[PDB]
Amino acid sequence: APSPEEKLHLITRNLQEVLGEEKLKEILKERELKIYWGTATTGKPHVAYFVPMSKIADFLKAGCEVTILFADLHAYLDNMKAPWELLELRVSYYENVIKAMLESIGVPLEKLKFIKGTDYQLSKEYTLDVYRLSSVVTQHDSKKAGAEVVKQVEHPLLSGLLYPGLQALDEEYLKVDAQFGGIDQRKIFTFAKKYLPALGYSKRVHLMNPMVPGLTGKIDLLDRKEDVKKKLKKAFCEPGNVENNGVLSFIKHVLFPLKSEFVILRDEKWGGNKTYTAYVDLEKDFAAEVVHPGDLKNSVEVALNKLLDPIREKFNTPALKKLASAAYP
Amino acid sequence: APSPEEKLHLITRNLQEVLGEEKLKEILKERELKIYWGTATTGKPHVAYFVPMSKIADFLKAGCEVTILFADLHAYLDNMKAPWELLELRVSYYENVIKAMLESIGVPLEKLKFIKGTDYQLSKEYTLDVYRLSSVVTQHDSKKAGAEVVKQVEHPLLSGLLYPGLQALDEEYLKVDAQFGGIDQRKIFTFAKKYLPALGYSKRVHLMNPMVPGLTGKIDLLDRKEDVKKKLKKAFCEPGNVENNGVLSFIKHVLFPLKSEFVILRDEKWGGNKTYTAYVDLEKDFAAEVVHPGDLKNSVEVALNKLLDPIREKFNTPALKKLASAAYP
Ligand SMILES: N[C@@H](Cc1ccc(O)cc1)C(=O)O
Numbered sequence: 169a170p171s172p173e174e175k176l177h178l179i180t181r182n183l184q185e186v187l188g189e190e191k192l193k194e195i196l197k198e199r200e201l202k203i204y205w206g207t208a209t210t211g212k213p214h215v216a217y218f219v220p221m222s223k224i225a226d227f228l229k230a231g232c233e234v235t236i237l238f239a240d241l242h243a244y245l246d247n248m249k250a251p252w253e254l255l256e257l258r259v260s261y262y263e264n265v266i267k268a269m270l271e272s273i274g275v276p277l278e279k280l281k282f283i284k285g286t287d288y289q290l291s292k293e294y295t296l297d298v299y300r301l302s303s304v305v306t307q308h309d310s311k312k313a314g315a316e317v318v319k320q321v322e323h324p325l326l327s328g329l330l331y332p333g334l335q336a337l338d339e340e341y342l343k344v345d346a347q348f349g350g351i352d353q354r355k356i357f358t359f360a361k362k363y364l365p366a367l368g369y370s371k372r373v374h375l376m377n378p379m380v381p382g383l384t385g386k387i388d389l390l391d392r393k394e395d396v397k398k399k400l401k402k403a404f405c406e407p408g409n410v411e412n413n414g415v416l417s418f419i420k421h422v423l424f425p426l427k428s429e430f431v432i433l434r435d436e437k438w439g440g441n442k443t444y445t446a447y448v449d450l451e452k453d454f455a456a457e458v459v460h461p462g463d464l465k466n467s468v469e470v471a472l473n474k475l476l477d478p479i480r481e482k483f484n485t486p487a488l489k490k491l492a493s494a495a496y497p
Numbered sequence: 498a499p500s501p502e503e504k505l506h507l508i509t510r511n512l513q514e515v516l517g518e519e520k521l522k523e524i525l526k527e528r529e530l531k532i533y534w535g536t537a538t539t540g541k542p543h544v545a546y547f548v549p550m551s552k553i554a555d556f557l558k559a560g561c562e563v564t565i566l567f568a569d570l571h572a573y574l575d576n577m578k579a580p581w582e583l584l585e586l587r588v589s590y591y592e593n594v595i596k597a598m599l600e601s602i603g604v605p606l607e608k609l610k611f612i613k614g615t616d617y618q619l620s621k622e623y624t625l626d627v628y629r630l631s632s633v634v635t636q637h638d639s640k641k642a643g644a645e646v647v648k649q650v651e652h653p654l655l656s657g658l659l660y661p662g663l664q665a666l667d668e669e670y671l672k673v674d675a676q677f678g679g680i681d682q683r684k685i686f687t688f689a690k691k692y693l694p695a696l697g698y699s700k701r702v703h704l705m706n707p708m709v710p711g712l713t714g715k716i717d718l719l720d721r722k723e724d725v726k727k728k729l730k731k732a733f734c735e736p737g738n739v740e741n742n743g744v745l746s747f748i749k750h751v752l753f754p755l756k757s758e759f760v761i762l763r764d765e766k767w768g769g770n771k772t773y774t775a776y777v778d779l780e781k782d783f784a785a786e787v788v789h790p791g792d793l794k795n796s797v798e799v800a801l802n803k804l805l806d807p808i809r810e811k812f813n814t815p816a817l818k819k820l821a822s823a824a825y826p
C-alpha cells in the first residue's frame with residue numbers, strides 16, 4: 169500500500185479531466201509518477217491557491233515525485249504581469265508562501281522539488297529547442313493555444329505567442345511523465361501533446377482541475393482573522409443552491425481532501441453539529457436547506473482560519489513583511 | 498588621405514539609399530566606421546554576390562572595420578531554407594567562397610572579421626534580449642518587417658516572426674555603427690531603428706544597395722568557362738536599352754568599382770576598343786547603339802572569367818569538391 173489502484177484514485181480524485189489514462193496506468197504498475205505544476209510569479213497568491221495545493225498534497229500522498237515550477241520568465245512574457253526588476257522578489261514571495269501552505273496542510277516537503285524557470289529556460293539547449301519548435305509551430309496554432317491563458321490585448325505581442333511553446337518544452341526539461349493544472353490550460357496541454365513529438369520528445373499525461381468558483385470574488389493568505397470574517401459573509405451563498413457555490417466548492421476541493429470529513433457547526437435548535445464523511449451527503453443536506461448558508465460559512469471560516477494561522481505567524485517575522493512590500497510596491 | 502569626405506564617397510557610392518547621414522558624418526570626422534553585412538547560409542552563392550562584395554571592398558578601402566555575418570540560425574528560421582544537419586557545412590562553403598571572391602577582387606582580408614550567428618545567438622545574454630524584444634514588438638510589426646525578406650507561406654511559422662528581431666539584435670551584439678544590405682532589407686532596418694532603443698540600444702546607420710537585375714535570371718561561381726559563355730549570350734540585353742539591363746548593371750556595380758574603368762572590346766570596323774572612365778559615358782554609347790549587345794557581353798565575359806579563375810582554381814583542390822557536394826546533396 170498504496171496499490172497502483174489506490175495511487176490512481178488519489179492522483180485523479182476531484183479532477184475534471186484525465187488525458188492519457190493508458191500511459192498513467194502503465195507507469196503506476198511499475199514506478200512512481202513524475203509530475204509537475206507551474207505557476208507564473210505574477211499577483212499575490214490568495215486562498216484559492218489551496219485548490220491546486222490540495223491536488224499537490226494528493227500527488228505526494230500517492231508517492232509521486234512532484235516538481236513545483238516558479239515560472240518567472242512566463243510572468244514576464246504574459247504582457248509583463250511581472251517586470252524584470254521584481255521577478256526575483258516575486259519568486260521568493262511565491263516560494264515562501266507555497267511552502268507555508270503546504271506545511272499548513274501537513275504535506276511532507278520531501279519528494280518535492282522547487283525550480284524557477286530562469287534556472288534552465290535561458291540555457292543553450294533549451295533555447296535551441298525553442299527555435300526548433302518555432303520552426304514547426306504556426307503563428308495560428310500558438311495564438312490559439314494561449315487564448316484562455318495569456319492576457320488577450322488589442323495588439324498581440326510576440327511574447328504571447330512564445331508562451332505556450334515554452335510551457336510545452338518545460339514538460340521535457342523537467343523530465344516529468346505528467347503535468348497538472350486547471351482546465352483553462354487544456355489548449356496548451358493539447359498543443360504540447362501535438363508538438364513535443366516533432367522535436368523527438370514524448371507526449372505527457374495531462375491532469376486538469378475544474379474551474380472552481382472563489383470563496384468571495386479576494387481573501388489574502390495573510391489577511392487577519394476579522395478581514396477573513398468580514399470577507400466571508402459578503403460571499404455568495406444562496407440557501408439550497410448547490411451550483412456555483414464558492415463555499416461548498418472550497419469544502420469539496422480543499423477541506424474534505426485535507427481531513428476526509430467535514431464538520432458542520434449548527435445550534436442544538438437545528439440539530440447540533442453534524443460530521444459528513446462524504447461531500448455528496450453535505451450537498452444533499454444543503455440542497456434540502458437543513459444546512460443554512462450562515463452555518464456553512466461559520467464552519468468554513470473556522471477551518472480556514474486554522475489553515476491560515478501558521479502562515480500568518482510565519483510571515484510575522486522581520487524581513488518577510490519587507491519581502492511582501494518589496495514584491496508588491 | 499582618405500579624408501572624411503573621400504571615405505564618405507567610397508562608402509556611399511552606388512547605393513540606392515543612406516539612412517542616418519548625420520551620425521555617419523559625425524563618426525567619420527573622428528574614427529573608422531564599424532559596419533557589417535549578413536548573409537543567411539542558404540542556397541549556393543552565384544555571381545550576383547559580386548554586387549554586395551564590391552561594396553564590402555569599398556568599405557575596406559575607406560578604412561572601415563567590416564564584419565561578415567554568416568547567419569546560420571537565420572537560414573534555419575527562414576522556413577528551413579537550410580536544415581540543422583547541413584548548417585555547419587554551408588557555413589564552411591559560404592566562408593570559403595566569400596573569402597575567394599574577395600581575394601579575387603584584391604581586397605585586404607585584414608580589418609575583415611568573419612563570424613557565424615550561432616557563435617553568439619544562443620548565448621544567455623542574447624536570448625534574454627530576444628525575450629525582452631518579444632515583450633515590446635507586436636506580432637503585426639514583426640510580420641510586417643519580414644514581408645520582403647522571409648519566405649511567405651500560407652500558414653506563417655513562428656520562426657518567421659522571430660527572424661527580424663534577431664537581425665535587429667545582431668547590430669548591437671556585433672557592436673557596429675552601421676549595417677549594409679539590399680534595399681529589400683529596408684523594413685527590417687527601420688524595424689531595428691524603431692525597437693533597439695526600447696532595449697536601451699542605439700539606432701544604427703543603414704546603407705542600402707539597389708535591387709540589381711541578374712546577369713541572366715544562374716551563373717555559379719564555379720561554373721566552367723564554356724558554361725559562363727553559354728549562359729551569357731542567352732542573357733537579356735536589348736540594343737539601346739539601358740534600363741533593366743543585367744549586363745550593364747553588372748558593369749556599373751562590380752567592374753567599374755573594381756577597376757575605375759571599363760574596356761569595350763569592339764572590332765576595328767566599328768571603332769576598335771574604347772576605354773570608359775565613367776559609367777554614364779558607356780551608358781550614353783549603349784543608348785546610341787554604338788556599343789552592340791554582343792560586344793558588351795564579350796567584354797563582360799572576359800572580365801568575369803578573370804574574376805572566377807582564381808576561385809575555380811582554389812576550389813579545384815581535394816576536399817573542396819567533397820565540401821561542395823556535401824553542402825548541397
Ligand atoms: N500557464 C500556467 C503557468 C505555467 C507556466 C509554465 C509552465 O511550464 C507550466 C505552467 C498558468 O496559467 O497558471
Ligand SMILES: N[C@@H](Cc1ccc(O)cc1)C(=O)O
Pocket residue numbers: 534535536537566568571646663664665667668678682
Ligand atoms: N536578412 C538578410 C540576412 C541577414 C541575417 C541576419 C543579419 O543580422 C543580417 C542579415 C538577407 O535576407 O540576406
